[PDB]
Design an enzyme around this catalytic site. Structure first.
Site, PDB file in Angstrom:
ATOM      1  N   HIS A 169      -4.112  11.773   9.295  1.00 60.06           N
ATOM      2  CA  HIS A 169      -3.693  11.327  10.613  1.00 60.06           C
ATOM      3  C   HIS A 169      -2.236  11.704  10.818  1.00 60.06           C
ATOM      4  O   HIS A 169      -1.504  11.978   9.864  1.00 60.06           O
ATOM      5  CB  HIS A 169      -3.897   9.816  10.805  1.00 60.06           C
ATOM      6  CG  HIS A 169      -3.189   8.958   9.800  1.00 60.06           C
ATOM      7  ND1 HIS A 169      -3.865   8.182   8.886  1.00 60.06           N
ATOM      8  CD2 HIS A 169      -1.872   8.722   9.591  1.00 60.06           C
ATOM      9  CE1 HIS A 169      -2.995   7.521   8.142  1.00 60.06           C
ATOM     10  NE2 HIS A 169      -1.779   7.834   8.549  1.00 60.06           N
TER      11      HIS A 169
ATOM     12  N   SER B 154      -3.308   9.962   4.700  1.00 59.48           N
ATOM     13  CA  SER B 154      -2.345  10.932   5.218  1.00 59.48           C
ATOM     14  C   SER B 154      -1.347  11.423   4.175  1.00 59.48           C
ATOM     15  O   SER B 154      -1.217  12.630   3.945  1.00 59.48           O
ATOM     16  CB  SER B 154      -1.593  10.308   6.395  1.00 59.48           C
ATOM     17  OG  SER B 154      -0.861   9.169   5.976  1.00 59.48           O
TER      18      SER B 154
END
Lengths: 192, 111, 192, 192, 192, 191, 192, 192
Positions: G121, G96
């Protein structure tokens, strides 16, 4: 990580750590819980600076939460012994020992920042064992309490009985409040 | 070239070479020209406290100062060290032009 | 972190740690719990100074809470073996071993700060095992107690019987009280 | 921290740690629990000094509470192998392994301090597993006990039977008692 | 810590480490539990010495209790690969893996101290998981056992059958017994 | 404590650690469990050597019981990315990740010692959470398995089907077996 | 241990670390978990290189599993602030935060190695306390989610609605998939 | 660890750590939990830089999650006392203490990155003991809360009542919101 700085000396340039550079200017940093190891380091710095120039004043910065009583006394006795006047400064806070060493500074050269705090309390100690040994250790801490209150009364200028009443329980003194009490002489607000 | 009073050399020897071409005639030698190579090596070393007493460097510059601007300089007759020897050739460098050429390595970084 | 200081010499400037700079002046720092490792360091420092100048007097600052007996005896025997007079000073406090080494200093050169706290007690030990082994180890600590008390009487000058009674339990002695007992000779209140 | 000292030679000033400076003078420090790593370090120092001057005598200061037997044998074998005589000095104490190395020194050059404490005991070990394996390890340690006792009898001069009887249980010997037993030759009371 | 040493050469004074100084003389120290990290360090030392002088011999000092087979096997292959002969000396002890490297030394150059103890045993390992995986790991360790025994027989000279029976359980061998078994060639009792 | 070695040349004498001295000879030491930090260090050595000379070959000594898969791919991709041929020598052992890097070396420059042990297995992983997240991670690790098998098949030269059956479970291999399998090219018995 | 390397200069040879040597070539390594201390180090490198040559690009190698969002934003803001184009390279993986910094690189200078695994994410966090405090913290993390998604859409070029759907749960993107998605511009198969 | 960088300048090139190099440019990195040790170090840097050029501004980068109050006041007082204006920049985040130091920068010289976050809350502390002592500590922390709100109101320019209401509970402020509130003066998006 401690940073390194450069000094422009006559004999070229030399690299010194941030603390060593200030040590050359008669500035000692007292930070963290007081203990035997760090106390013996400050004592070494005071003696070394005395040899270089006894007339010049030594500056001590006190930002600590207190510590061992014995270790602090080594610093106090060293300050009074050496001829130069030790100018104590309080940054952030000054607990029982930090305050005792703060007020121990030379008269008229004790300073504190406006937003600094001070805290004075009686000694803390304990012992586990037989009643006979308990009475012994109890007598010393009581004697240390009286001894520390006598010295604090001398520097602050207040009566011995007054110090006992205040030191019985934790007391918090702001920077201006300390001036009235006598722990410090003046406040360093801005450079003049 | 090296500072005076040392075993390396003396700056006065420069005139000896110029006298060879001038037939050791000081009259015409005064109107000559001189070329000094590798002057970059004479530069002062970095952050020297001067206790070292640099002979190869700064010492050479201090002696050349009066030589370039013009001054009577005693010159040995031929291949001899400076000494109490009575015979010395007085050559004035006031009219003797000097061209100092050297490769100042590292100067580009400075600029 | 130990600060670095510059020393000016004919050869040129040199950088020294605060502890090494003082070692050059015949100053040895005893700090913390006594043990075999730090003791060997002090022993090496003592022998090194003896070679440089066996006539000049050495100084040994003592700020420690005590420790192993065997490690302390190595320092004591070394101080007595070498020719230079070892001047012991008490900073902050001096426990059983710190006091035994403090009083072991050369006669007339033992000092203590005004607020220092000296303490003397008998040896502490223990053993777990068969009864036969217990008797063996128990006899050693008794000899050590008798041997240590014998030496204290020699330096302090007090009778052996008095040392036994006073050392049976922890006894705290202030700086002035120590002078009368004989552990130290004088107090360093201010530099004259 | 280890203090650094300056050595002055014709070549110029040189900086050494307090241990390396003494190593230059053929002095090796044996301190703490004996183990594989510290033993290899001592072995390297003995070999290094042998090359520098195989005629001069080496000194070994033993202040240790004992340790592994296998590591000690590497030191013992190295001492007897090299031509230089190894002088062993006991400071503070010398347990089973420290004592074995102490007595293993050159005949006539073994010294001990007056307040030193020497202790000699039989080897101790343990094994967990099958009975067959126990018999193997049990036989091996018995060989070490007999082998170590045979070597102690040679240096001390005591009979093998006498060594076995005394080493059955922990035996503490003072400096004068050790001289009679044969572990050491003389005592270094004062500098002459 | 490691004591620094000075090497006097025409180029000038050179400050070397105790281990680095011996490495300059083709001496490698194998100490402690054999692991991948230390093995790669020894391998680098061997390769470096090979380049400097492939004709001169290399001396490997083995004092360790054994360890991983994969890491130890990387040193064995390195010794056999390089042209210079690798002499192996046993100090203190040489366990299963330490003994394999000891006997793996060049023929006629393997040495052992008189009091050193050489122990050899079969490989030991374990696995947790499904039965299928256990069969894979069980077959792998058995192949290693035969591989190690085959090589050990080659250097010692004993038959594979004898080595298999003797190494079925821990077997301790003294320095003289090792000579007869073939693990080493001579005993370095004293310098000649 | 790593030892210090002195290099003597006409210009002067310099002191270097044993690992740095060998680095000058284009020798990198891959050791221990593979991870992001150690792998990053090896990558820095490859780029540094590439800058010094992009033509000379680089040697890599592999001794490790595998490790993180992601860290390994960084080393593998770096070796193929740089022009210099990276030689691989197996010392002691080479597990799943070590073996992948071993066989990844330049064709004809893969070596192994006679007593080295080479083991290959499929990736290992785990995830805790909701069933939906499990399906995501299960597909990811399976894709990695197929990708690694494809890469291993390419270097070894074995068919992908053969690599799949063999790598389903731990398969310990010896130096001679690796030569025929295709993981290595030759054995360095003696000089 | 970090291996030092030697660089030849006009003045003479200089010893440099492996990371410091590459830093001179405008190469920064982002490795491990993202946190405040490491982020400030990367920021210092970006600023330092800007002073040397604000026109020359910078190469940032990213291999990390993600970390603190606040720390990563400092790096992201620093990259956009300085004039030099930051060429991000994904080695091994980019989670991420690693992916957010990867796609943040200068348009046309974002690369990814063929076998790297990218993952994106939504932010994850948590707070324990009163319901009122939970409302405040829940609002702040949702804002971060909206802010991060808005920036990802800008660099990748995809619609905000598409980013929200994909980032609701973990999504693993290979190197070719990332190219079409917009995270990276092209794959670095070989130097040529 | 930190990468060493070389300063290219005449009279020799000096190698400094990346943090020390920036310190020469009057840049101090305040990061991590505020404490006595880190704060004391920053105080030395501020005082040190003052000696070089009291007129030039000093830059402070804040990426701290908050910390002790006493340590923070040591920095705040130092910032006010020194004549050179202290330019504060918020990188990543600035919590209660970090925000107090951020807003304490000279008016017109306070900056924050676009994606930086700021949060302000009242002081949190606790004490265990007698009710009498609790009253002392409760009064002390309440005075600190009032004192801190007074200073925050002064720099931000907000009314004291408004500061009290906003700081009752954690309040997260983005970079643009901080400008309106008054904590910072402007945002640094791209170099001009």
């Amino acid at each position: 990580l401690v940073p390194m700085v450069i000094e422009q000396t006559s004999r070229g340039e030399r690299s010194f750590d941030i603390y060593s550079r200030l040590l050359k200017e008669r500035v000692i940093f007292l930070t963290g819980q007081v203990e035997d190891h760090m106390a013996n380091l400050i004592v070494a710095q005071m003696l070394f600076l005395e040899a270089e120039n006894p007339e010049k004043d030594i500056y001590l910065y006190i930002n600590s939460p207190g510590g061992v009583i014995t270790a602090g006394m080594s610093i106090y006795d060293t300050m009074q012994f050496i001829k130069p006047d030790v100018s104590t400064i309080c940054m952030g806070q000054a607990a029982s020992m930090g305050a005792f060493l703060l007020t121990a500074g030379a008269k008229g050269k004790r300073f504190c920042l406006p937003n600094s705090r001070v805290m004075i309390h009686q000694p803390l100690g304990g012992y586990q064992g037989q009643a006979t040994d308990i009475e012994i250790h109890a007598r010393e801490i009581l004697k240390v309490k009286g001894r520390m209150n006598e010295l604090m009364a001398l520097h602050t200028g207040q009566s011995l009985e007054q110090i006992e009443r205040d030191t019985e329980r934790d007391r918090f003194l702001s920077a201006p409040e300390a001036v009235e009490y006598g722990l410090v002489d003046s406040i360093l607000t801005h450079r003049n | 070239l090296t500072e005076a009073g040392y075993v390396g050399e003396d700056v006065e020897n420069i005139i000896q070479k110029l006298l060879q071409k001038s037939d050791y005639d000081v009259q015409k030698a005064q109107r000559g020209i001189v070329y000094i190579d590798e002057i970059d090596k004479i530069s002062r070393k970095s952050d020297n406290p001067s206790i070292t007493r640099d002979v190869s460097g700064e010492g050479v510059q201090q002696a050349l100062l009066k030589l370039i601007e013009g001054t009577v300089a005693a010159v040995p007759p031929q291949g001899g060290r400076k000494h109490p020897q009575q015979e010395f050739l007085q050559v004035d460098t006031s009219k003797i032009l000097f061209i100092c050429g050297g490769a100042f390595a590292g100067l580009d970084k400075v600029i």
